[PDB]
Design an enzyme around this catalytic site. Structure first.
Site: not given
Ligand SMILES: CN1CCC(Oc2ccc3ncn(-c4cc(OCc5ccccc5C(F)(F)F)c(C(N)=O)s4)c3c2)CC1
Ligand SMILES: [Cl-]
Ligand SMILES: [Cl-]
Length: 251
Positions: A13, A131
């Site tokens: 992402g 949140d």
């Molecule tokens: C298709 N679309 C769905 C969601 C996906 O994002 C993922 C996929 C696998 C992961 N394993 C750990 N993380 C975490 C990401 C995060 O913050 C970023 C985020 C949040 C919500 C949706 C997408 C994202 C992105 F930036 F990764 F895209 C975490 C936190 N702040 O603790 S943990 C995954 C996120 C794949 C794309």
């Protein structure tokens, strides 16, 4: 704790706060993710606040909270990488959006898993003193659920008391999240925040779909009570007959 210790596989992402990439730890081949942050434009003040939050991130260790692994400073590009657990099932917002677009409701068993595991994640947070929106709730490859850390938007999950500015407020938000998982829409919808606030104050909403048990409707409805003291505590939620061992996390 050097960037060279890892190899980027691909970008998951992009957006506001740099990139999120799927990576592989060289030492043992473990699949992780990292967030790529450019702090180049940050003041010492801002970077300071950044350090303190990353430090707290290291404090939370729990099966239902996304695990922090590492932080890597790359002063050459003024980039900071935060290394976290990879959750192959993605986030809950994607799951709901998917269900909404495909017109397919989620299994009661899945909703009970999310209720059980998120309630425990909350229970842990309350102890420490984040949140509870679908985009901040992740799924691994083993039916486990993990809570992540983190103007234009509509505050769908804003509790009544928050509206008129409380651990029970977290219960309301959990209520909204579980409701949306079942109904594929939030319990209160509106085009403006003024309209939204009016609906929240009335405290009325549709029953979740009939495919869901009266017992599950009952507990979600209770979390959406107008009075914070009528909402169940984390303890009272977990006592519910619906919730069983298999709904909890498993390694
Ligand atoms: C298709 N679309 C769905 C969601 C996906 O994002 C993922 C996929 C696998 C992961 N394993 C750990 N993380 C975490 C990401 C995060 O913050 C970023 C985020 C949040 C919500 C949706 C997408 C994202 C992105 F930036 F990764 F895209 C975490 C936190 N702040 O603790 S943990 C995954 C996120 C794949 C794309
Ligand atoms: Cl539908
Ligand atoms: Cl079902």
């Amino acid at each position: 704790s050097r960037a060279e210790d890892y190899e980027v596989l691909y970008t998951i992402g992009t957006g506001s706060y740099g990139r999120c990439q799927k990576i592989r730890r060289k030492s043992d081949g473990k699949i992780l993710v990292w967030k790529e942050l450019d702090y180049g434009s940050m003041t010492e003040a801002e970077k300071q606040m950044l350090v303190s939050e990353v430090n707290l991130l290291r404090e939370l260790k729990h099966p239902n909270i996304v695990r922090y692994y590492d932080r890597i400073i790359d002063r050459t590009n003024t980039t900071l990488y935060i290394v976290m657990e990879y959750c192959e099932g993605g986030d809950l917002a994607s799951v709901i959006t998917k269900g909404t677009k495909e017109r397919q409701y989620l299994d009661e068993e899945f909703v009970l898993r999310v209720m059980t595991q998120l309630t425990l994640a909350l229970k842990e947070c309350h102890r420490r003193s984040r949140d509870l929106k679908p985009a901040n709730v992740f799924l691994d490859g083993k039916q486990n659920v993990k809570l992540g850390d983190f103007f234009v938007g509509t505050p769908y999950y804003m509790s009544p008391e928050q509206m008129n500015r409380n651990e029970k407020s977290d219960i309301w938000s959990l209520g909204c999240l579980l409701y949306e998982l079942c109904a594929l829409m939030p319990p209160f919808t509106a085009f403006s925040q003024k309209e939204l606030a009016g609906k929240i104050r009335e405290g009325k909403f549709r029953r979740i779909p009939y495919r869901y048990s009266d017992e599950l409707n009952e507990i979600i409805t209770r979390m959406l009570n107008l009075k914070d003291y009528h909402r169940p505590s984390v303890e009272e939620i977990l006592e519910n007959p619906l919730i069983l061992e298999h709904h909890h996390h498993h390694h």
